[PDB]
Design a protein around this ligand. Structure first.
Ligand SMILES: Nc1ncnc2c1ncn2[C@@H]1O[C@H](CSCC[C@H](N)C(=O)O)[C@@H](O)[C@H]1O
Ligand SMILES: Nc1ncnc2c1ncn2[C@@H]1O[C@H](CSCC[C@H](N)C(=O)O)[C@@H](O)[C@H]1O
Ligand SMILES: C[n+]1cn([C@@H]2O[C@H](CO)[C@@H](O)[C@H]2O)c2nc(N)[nH]c(=O)c21
Ligand SMILES: C[n+]1cn([C@@H]2O[C@H](CO)[C@@H](O)[C@H]2O)c2nc(N)[nH]c(=O)c21
Lengths: 291, 291
C-alpha cells in the first residue's frame, strides 16, 4: 500500500511542490471511482467558495448567477444549506439544457433555458440591477480552440455582470496543443478533490475589490508547468493513504475534502471539527446517493 | 487679467480639485493659439513618458513601437534626443499614412505603411521577439462607437505586444453619448499642456510589472466627472497667469510645460532648473518652427 503522513493537503495549485513528465497512457486509466463523483466534485468546490464569501460578509443578499448549471442536481443541496442557515440569496440558473426537476418550485431559484451570449449577459445585467451578483461558471463547449472560446466568454461574464466575486472553471490547454497566449482573471487556483483521476482542472476563485479587474497571462511555458504539477498530484499525491489522518476514509481525496468541509458553517454545534466534517460528509453523500 | 500664484500645476487627472458644468458653446471657441501646437503637445507628453522609463532603467535597449505615428515630425526630435544622450533604442513607426521624410535614412528607425490589426500585431510581435517593447499609441479613427473601437484595439496592442510600458491616447466618451461601460488599462492619467483649448484628452502611462495586466472600468458617471473636471481645467485653470512663476512666459501651459521639462535628462550641465528648461524649450520651439 502507498501510505504516508501528511500535515495538510495541497489546497491551491501554487502549493504543489513537485512535478512529473506526463505519461499519455494515463488517459486510458479509470477516470472515476465514485457514483455521481462529478456533482460531489462541484458541490465541495462550490460549498468552499460560497462559505468564504459568507466569511467575508458578501453572500447575504446577493443573486448567484450560475451559468452552465444543468442538470445541477447538487445545486439543490447548496441552496438548501444556505437557505436553512438563514442567508438570503436568489439563484438564477441559466443553461440551454434542462435542469433537474428537484430545482423547480422554489421561489428563490429561477431556471432559465438559454445559452448565454454577450448580448444576453447585458439583458440579465439590466434585469438583475441593482442586486449584487456572484458568478459561478461551469460552461463546456475539448479543442484548445474550444477552451479559449469558453475562457473568453467567462471574462465577458465578469466585465458585463460585474460581480462581487466569481468561481470559474479553469483547465489550462495542453502545451503540445498551444495556439496562443491568453489572459484569465486573477484568483486562487482551487484544487478539486474527487476530480476525475487525471484531470488538470481546477476552479478560479476571485473577489472583486474597487472597480479594477486584474488579469494574468498564460503562456505555453505555464501550460508545461500546469501539466507537470497536475500530473504529479494525480499520479502520486492523490494516490496517497494518509495514515496519520484518523477518519473513516484515509485516502488523499477524503483528507483534501476534510479540509474544505471544515470551513463550512453549520447550525448544529459540534465538540470537534471531525464531528462537524463527518456530519457534513454523511449529509452530502446521502443527498447525492453515494454509498 | 486673470492672474494667480500657483505652487505646482495639475500633472494628473486625479489632482484636478474642482469642476464646472460643461458649456456646449465652448466648442465654437478657438481651439489653438500656437502653430504646430499638436506636435508640441505630443512631443512634451512623449518626452515626459520616455524620460520616466529612462529613470526606471527600462528604456535602453527597447524597441519603441509607435502606432498612429504619421506624419510624426516631432518623433524626429524625440529620436535625436535619446540618440544624442546615448540611449540605444530602435523605433518602429507604423501607420497607414505617410511619415515626414525627415524620419527617413535613420538605421535605427523603421517606418511601416500599414494600418495595424490584431493579426498584424501578432506578426510584429513574432518579428520583434525577443526585444523588450515600449508601446505608444495615437491612433484615431469621433463617435463614441469610434472611441470604444480605438480603446479596444489599444488593449489588444498590449495583450499581444506585451510591452514593458505603454503610453495610450485617452479621452473618455461623452456622458450624453454613452453606449456601454468599458475597461482601459490602469495607468497615470497624464494631463497635456498645449492640448486644444477645450480638449478632454490625456495620455495613459503604464509600466507593466510581473505578468499581470490590471484594467479599470469606465462608467457613465465617470464620464460625467471627466467632463466636469476637464471643463473646469480648460475654462478656468488653463487661463491662469501664474505671477509667481518667473519665466519668459507666465501662462498656465508654460508653467505646466516647465514641470514636465524639468524631468528630462540632458548632456549639458546647468546651474539651475530654469536654465535647463529654458534650454529645452528653446530647442523644442526652434525644431518645431514655433516663434
Ligand atoms: N453559453 C452557455 N450558456 C449556458 N450554458 C452553457 C453555455 N455553453 C455550454 N453550456 C452548458 O454548460 C454545461 C456544462 S456541464 C455543467 C454541469 C453543471 N454545472 C452541474 O452542476 O451539473 C452544459 O449543460 C452546457 O449546456
Ligand atoms: N490601425 C491603425 N494603425 C495604424 N495607424 C492607424 C490606425 N488607425 C488610425 N491610424 C492612424 O492614426 C493616426 C492619427 S493622427 C497621429 C499623429 C501622429 N502621432 C503625429 O505625431 O503626428 C492617423 O495617421 C491614422 O492613419
Ligand atoms: C490530463 N490530460 C489528459 N489528456 C488527454 O485527455 C483525455 C481525456 O481526459 C485523456 O484520454 C488524455 O488523452 C492529456 N493529454 C495531454 N497531452 N496532456 C495532459 O496533461 C492530459
Ligand atoms: C470637450 N468637449 C467638446 N465637445 C464637442 O466636441 C467638438 C470638437 O472639439 C466641440 O465643437 C464640441 O461640440 C463636447 N461635447 C460634449 N457634450 N462634452 C464635452 O465635454 C465636449
Amino acid at each position: 500500500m502507498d501510505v504516508v503522513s501528511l500535515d495538510k493537503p495541497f489546497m491551491y495549485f501554487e502549493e504543489i511542490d513537485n512535478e512529473l513528465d506526463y505519461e499519455p497512457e494515463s488517459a486510458n486509466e479509470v477516470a472515476k471511482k465514485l457514483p455521481y463523483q462529478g456533482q460531489l466534485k462541484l458541490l465541495l468546490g462550490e460549498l468552499f467558495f460560497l462559505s468564504k464569501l459568507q466569511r467575508h460578509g458578501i453572500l447575504d443578499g446577493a443573486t448567484v448567477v450560475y451559468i452552465g448549471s444543468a442538470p445541477g442536481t447538487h445545486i439543490r443541496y447548496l441552496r438548501d444549506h444556505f437557505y436553512n442557515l438563514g442567508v438570503i440569496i436568489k439563484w438564477m440558473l441559466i443553461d440551454g439544457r434542462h435542469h433537474d426537476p428537484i430545482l423547480n418550485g422554489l421561489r428563490d431559484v429561477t431556471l432559465v433555458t438559454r445559452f448565454v451570449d454577450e448580448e444576453y449577459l447585458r439583458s440579465i445585467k439590466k434585469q438583475l440591477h441593482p442586486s449584487k451578483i456572484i458568478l459561478i461558471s461551469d460552461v463546456r463547449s475539448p479543442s484548445t480552440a474550444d477552451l479559449l472560446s469558453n475562457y473568453a466568454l467567462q471574462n465577458v461574464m465578469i466585465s458585463i455582470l460585474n460581480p462581487v466575486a466569481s468561481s470559474l472553471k479553469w483547465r489550462c490547454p495542453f502545451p503540445d496543443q498551444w495556439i496562443k497566449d491568453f489572459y484569465i482573471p486573477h484568483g486562487n487556483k482551487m484544487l478539486q478533490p474527487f476530480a476525475p483521476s487525471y484531470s488538470a482542472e481546477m476552479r478560479l476563485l476571485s473577489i472583486y475589490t474597487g472597480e479594477n479587474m486584474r488579469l494574468t497571462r498564460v503562456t505555453k511555458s505555464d501550460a508545461v508547468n500546469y501539466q507537470k504539477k497536475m500530473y504529479y498530484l494525480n499520479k502520486i499525491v492523490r494516490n496517497k493513504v494518509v495514515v496519520n489522518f484518523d477518519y473513516p476514509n484515509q485516502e488523499y481525496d477524503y483528507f483534501h475534502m476534510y479540509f474544505m468541509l471544515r470551513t463550512v458553517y453549520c447550525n448544529k454545534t459540534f465538540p470537534t471539527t471531525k464531528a462537524k466534517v463527518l456530519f457534513l460528509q454523511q449529509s452530502i453523500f446521502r443527498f447525492l446517493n453515494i454509498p
